[PDB]
mmCIF file of C-alpha atoms and ligand atoms in Angstrom:
data_model
loop_
_atom_site.group_PDB
_atom_site.id
_atom_site.type_symbol
_atom_site.label_atom_id
_atom_site.label_comp_id
_atom_site.label_asym_id
_atom_site.label_seq_id
_atom_site.Cartn_x
_atom_site.Cartn_y
_atom_site.Cartn_z
ATOM 1 C CA UNK A 1 -48.769 -35.039 -32.019
ATOM 2 C CA UNK A 2 -47.083 -38.012 -30.324
ATOM 3 C CA UNK A 3 -43.914 -38.177 -32.440
ATOM 4 C CA UNK A 4 -40.372 -37.555 -31.236
ATOM 5 C CA UNK A 5 -38.478 -34.653 -32.805
ATOM 6 C CA UNK A 6 -34.800 -35.035 -33.674
ATOM 7 C CA UNK A 7 -32.627 -32.784 -31.504
ATOM 8 C CA UNK A 8 -29.834 -31.786 -33.894
ATOM 9 C CA UNK A 9 -28.912 -28.304 -32.619
ATOM 10 C CA UNK A 10 -25.291 -28.483 -31.474
ATOM 11 C CA UNK A 11 -25.440 -26.118 -28.505
ATOM 12 C CA UNK A 12 -22.748 -23.416 -28.462
ATOM 13 C CA UNK A 13 -23.667 -21.254 -25.461
ATOM 14 C CA UNK A 14 -20.589 -19.248 -24.460
ATOM 15 C CA UNK A 15 -21.400 -17.459 -21.211
ATOM 16 C CA UNK A 16 -20.228 -13.834 -21.549
ATOM 17 C CA UNK A 17 -17.361 -12.515 -19.466
ATOM 18 C CA UNK A 18 -18.852 -10.921 -16.361
ATOM 19 C CA UNK A 19 -17.833 -7.371 -15.511
ATOM 20 C CA UNK A 20 -15.111 -6.659 -12.949
ATOM 21 C CA UNK A 21 -14.902 -3.419 -10.952
ATOM 22 C CA UNK A 22 -11.226 -3.204 -10.027
ATOM 23 C CA UNK A 23 -10.595 -1.880 -6.527
ATOM 24 C CA UNK A 24 -8.112 0.870 -5.707
ATOM 25 C CA UNK A 25 -6.039 -1.224 -3.317
ATOM 26 C CA UNK A 26 -4.337 0.738 -0.527
ATOM 27 C CA UNK A 27 -1.345 -1.025 1.019
ATOM 28 C CA UNK A 28 0.127 1.684 3.273
ATOM 29 C CA UNK A 29 -2.099 4.544 4.391
ATOM 30 C CA UNK A 30 -0.837 8.122 4.479
ATOM 31 C CA UNK A 31 -0.379 7.919 8.255
ATOM 32 C CA UNK A 32 1.951 4.921 7.944
ATOM 33 C CA UNK A 33 3.919 6.563 5.130
ATOM 34 C CA UNK A 34 4.367 9.682 7.266
ATOM 35 C CA UNK A 35 5.275 7.652 10.371
ATOM 36 C CA UNK A 36 7.818 5.486 8.528
ATOM 37 C CA UNK A 37 10.457 8.239 8.868
ATOM 38 C CA UNK A 38 12.628 8.561 11.967
ATOM 39 C CA UNK A 39 13.219 12.266 11.263
ATOM 40 C CA UNK A 40 10.029 14.293 10.797
ATOM 41 C CA UNK A 41 10.805 17.735 9.388
ATOM 42 C CA UNK A 42 7.679 19.384 10.810
ATOM 43 C CA UNK A 43 8.436 18.281 14.376
ATOM 44 C CA UNK A 44 12.053 19.441 14.064
ATOM 45 C CA UNK A 45 10.967 22.863 12.811
ATOM 46 C CA UNK A 46 8.382 23.148 15.593
ATOM 47 C CA UNK A 47 11.067 22.329 18.167
ATOM 48 C CA UNK A 48 13.407 24.927 16.657
ATOM 49 C CA UNK A 49 10.610 27.519 16.707
ATOM 50 C CA UNK B 1 33.325 26.715 40.032
ATOM 51 C CA UNK B 2 29.676 27.404 40.874
ATOM 52 C CA UNK B 3 26.727 29.384 39.475
ATOM 53 C CA UNK B 4 24.170 30.177 42.169
ATOM 54 C CA UNK B 5 20.646 30.867 40.930
ATOM 55 C CA UNK B 6 19.743 33.577 43.456
ATOM 56 C CA UNK B 7 20.553 34.671 47.045
ATOM 57 C CA UNK B 8 23.879 32.729 46.789
ATOM 58 C CA UNK B 9 22.452 29.896 48.919
ATOM 59 C CA UNK B 10 22.195 26.322 47.684
ATOM 60 C CA UNK B 11 21.140 22.744 48.500
ATOM 61 C CA UNK B 12 17.421 23.547 48.340
ATOM 62 C CA UNK B 13 14.935 20.876 47.227
ATOM 63 C CA UNK B 14 12.928 22.821 44.648
ATOM 64 C CA UNK B 15 9.848 21.166 43.159
ATOM 65 C CA UNK B 16 9.110 20.850 39.444
ATOM 66 C CA UNK B 17 6.024 22.552 38.047
ATOM 67 C CA UNK B 18 3.920 21.188 35.156
ATOM 68 C CA UNK B 19 4.964 24.291 33.143
ATOM 69 C CA UNK B 20 2.999 25.560 30.120
ATOM 70 C CA UNK B 21 2.316 23.509 26.996
ATOM 71 C CA UNK B 22 4.881 24.093 24.242
ATOM 72 C CA UNK B 23 4.730 21.210 21.730
ATOM 73 C CA UNK B 24 2.257 18.403 21.082
ATOM 74 C CA UNK B 25 4.878 15.834 22.175
ATOM 75 C CA UNK B 26 7.035 17.555 24.802
ATOM 76 C CA UNK B 27 5.675 17.581 28.370
ATOM 77 C CA UNK B 28 8.349 19.805 29.876
ATOM 78 C CA UNK B 29 8.557 20.200 33.663
ATOM 79 C CA UNK B 30 10.589 23.212 34.798
ATOM 80 C CA UNK B 31 11.569 24.648 38.188
ATOM 81 C CA UNK B 32 11.885 28.430 37.775
ATOM 82 C CA UNK B 33 8.674 28.677 35.709
ATOM 83 C CA UNK B 34 26.062 40.342 35.791
ATOM 84 C CA UNK B 35 23.815 37.727 37.400
ATOM 85 C CA UNK B 36 23.211 34.036 36.689
HETATM 86 C C1 LIG C 101 23.227 19.309 47.587
HETATM 87 O O1 LIG C 101 22.954 18.184 48.386
HETATM 88 C C2 LIG C 101 23.272 16.982 47.717
HETATM 89 C C3 LIG C 101 22.671 15.816 48.472
HETATM 90 O O2 LIG C 101 23.225 15.752 49.765
HETATM 91 C C4 LIG C 101 24.789 16.886 47.522
HETATM 92 O O3 LIG C 101 25.092 15.773 46.711
HETATM 93 C C5 LIG C 101 26.335 15.163 47.109
HETATM 94 O O4 LIG C 101 27.388 15.606 46.287
HETATM 95 C C6 LIG C 101 28.653 15.090 46.644
HETATM 96 C C7 LIG C 101 29.718 15.812 45.848
HETATM 97 O O5 LIG C 101 29.694 15.366 44.512
HETATM 98 C C8 LIG C 101 28.644 13.571 46.440
HETATM 99 O O6 LIG C 101 29.851 12.978 46.856
HETATM 100 C C9 LIG C 101 27.528 12.964 47.283
HETATM 101 O O7 LIG C 101 27.389 11.587 47.048
HETATM 102 C C10 LIG C 101 26.193 13.641 46.978
HETATM 103 N N1 LIG C 101 25.159 13.156 47.853
HETATM 104 C C11 LIG C 101 24.470 12.015 47.669
HETATM 105 C C12 LIG C 101 23.434 11.717 48.725
HETATM 106 O O8 LIG C 101 24.656 11.261 46.727
HETATM 107 C C13 LIG C 101 25.297 18.133 46.795
HETATM 108 O O9 LIG C 101 26.697 18.244 46.810
HETATM 109 C C14 LIG C 101 24.747 19.425 47.401
HETATM 110 N N2 LIG C 101 25.080 20.538 46.552
HETATM 111 C C15 LIG C 101 25.827 21.596 46.920
HETATM 112 C C16 LIG C 101 26.334 21.570 48.342
HETATM 113 O O10 LIG C 101 26.091 22.525 46.171
#
């Protein structure tokens, strides 16, 4: 018809928590961890050989 | 004291040869390539 309708629905729309795909963060690569040492055992053994 | 390499002569300007590869880092340059 042409009659207004009372809007009495108290909206409670709680948006769901969106998914998170946690990264595997890499701070120091293997090369840096191997190069962080002054004395490399492999090089010393190669020199001795 | 002295230790002559060979022929007992001395004061010879001997060149250095690129030598053969030994280690990935070392780039050795040698000369020779009851004696002494
Ligand atoms: C081979 O020749 C070199 C170059 O001439 C000689 O080097 C001299 O050595 C004496 C002794 O220690 C030093 O006082 C001189 O200063 C050196 N010369 C230079 C230009 O610095 C060397 O003695 C010679 N080797 C021998 C004769 O066995």
